[PDB]
Amino acid sequence: VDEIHAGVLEPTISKVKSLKSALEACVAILRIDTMITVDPEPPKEDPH
Amino acid sequence: HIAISTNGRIVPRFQDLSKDKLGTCSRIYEQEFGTTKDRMLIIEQSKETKTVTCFVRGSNKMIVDEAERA
Amino acid sequence: IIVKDQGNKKRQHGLEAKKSHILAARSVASIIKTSLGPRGLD
Amino acid sequence: MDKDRKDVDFDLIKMQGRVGGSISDSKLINGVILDKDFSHPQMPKEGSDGVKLAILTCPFEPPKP
Numbered sequence: 095v096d097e098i099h100a101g102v103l104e105p106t107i108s109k110v111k112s113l114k115s116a117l118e119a120c121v122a123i124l125r126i127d128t129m130i131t132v133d134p135e136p137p138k139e140d141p142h
Numbered sequence: 143h144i145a146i147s148t149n150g151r152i153v154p155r156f157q158d159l160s161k162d163k164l165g166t167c168s169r170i171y172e173q174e175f176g177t178t179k180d181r182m183l184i185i186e187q188s189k190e191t192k193t194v195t196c197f198v199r200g201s202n203k204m205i206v207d208e209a210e211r212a
Numbered sequence: 213i214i215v216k217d218q219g220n221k222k223r224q225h226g227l228e229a230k231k232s233h234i235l236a237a238r239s240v241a242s243i244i245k246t247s248l249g250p251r252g253l254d
Numbered sequence: 255m256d257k258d259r260k261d262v263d264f265d266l267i268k269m270q271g272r273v274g275g276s277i278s279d280s281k282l283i284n285g286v287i288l289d290k291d292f293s294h295p296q297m298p299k300e301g302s303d304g305v306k307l308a309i310l311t312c313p314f315e316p317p318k319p
């Protein structure tokens with residue numbers, strides 16, 4: 095059914111800012127091929 | 143940096159605050175539009191020369207610390 | 213001139229302890245080799 | 255370094271990034287930018303119509319020794 099004939103309507107801005115950022119996120123991860131993940135700082139747990 | 147930019151000399155102590163060290167400019171900007179609502183102070187324009195600045199933008203903060211790197 | 217008599221090596225640790233880093237170093241510059249040129253990745 | 259000839263050059267250029275937006279949003283500023291926000295209604299702001307700045311220095315509180 096024709097949407098304009100209906101109350102339904104979303105601001106153009108929303109359909110843009112969301113379409114655009116959805117891409118950058120995607121891209122940024124595409125460029126990824128290796129994730130070096132170094133451990134944090136452990137408790138001293140010193141035997142001495 | 144702030145000095146050589148806005149052409150305004152630094153003012154130390156209270157007695158001196160003279161009309162000499164005034165930074166001859168035409169407009170100060172404090173905008174908050176565009177995601178995110180967070181704002182940044184923009185200053186233009188100053189008669190002096192030799193200082194240039196650029197504001198980076200990107201989501202996740204990953205793209206900032208990388209567009210900056212790039 | 214050179215012949216049979218001479219003359220051993222006093223220690224061999226030198227040799228291998230050199231072939232060591234040559235590797236440990238290589239590996240780094242190896243797994244990083246993917247981010248060179250326009251078709252490199254982060 | 256233009257009209258100054260070739261030289262070893264250190265960057266006085268300042269690039270500050272706001273986490274909001276996409277790559278393209280970023281732009282050169284014809285002037286200066288500062289990370290610190292205004293005084294906000296602390297307090298009463300930008301931008302004084304025509305402006306005249308001041309690099310005020312030292313304390314500003316009630317005269318204390």
Ligand SMILES: Nc1ncnc2c1ncn2[C@@H]1O[C@@H](COP(=O)(O)OP(=O)(O)O)[C@@H](O)[C@H]1O
Nearest residue numbers: 211212244245246247248249250251252253254
């Ligand atoms: N048009 C091109 N086609 C293929 N490779 C290129 C091209 N332009 C530059 N490169 C390669 O990429 C460069 C090296 O970049 P480098 O600082 O080592 O890491 P990165 O590639 O991530 O910037 C070049 O010197 C070159 O070997």
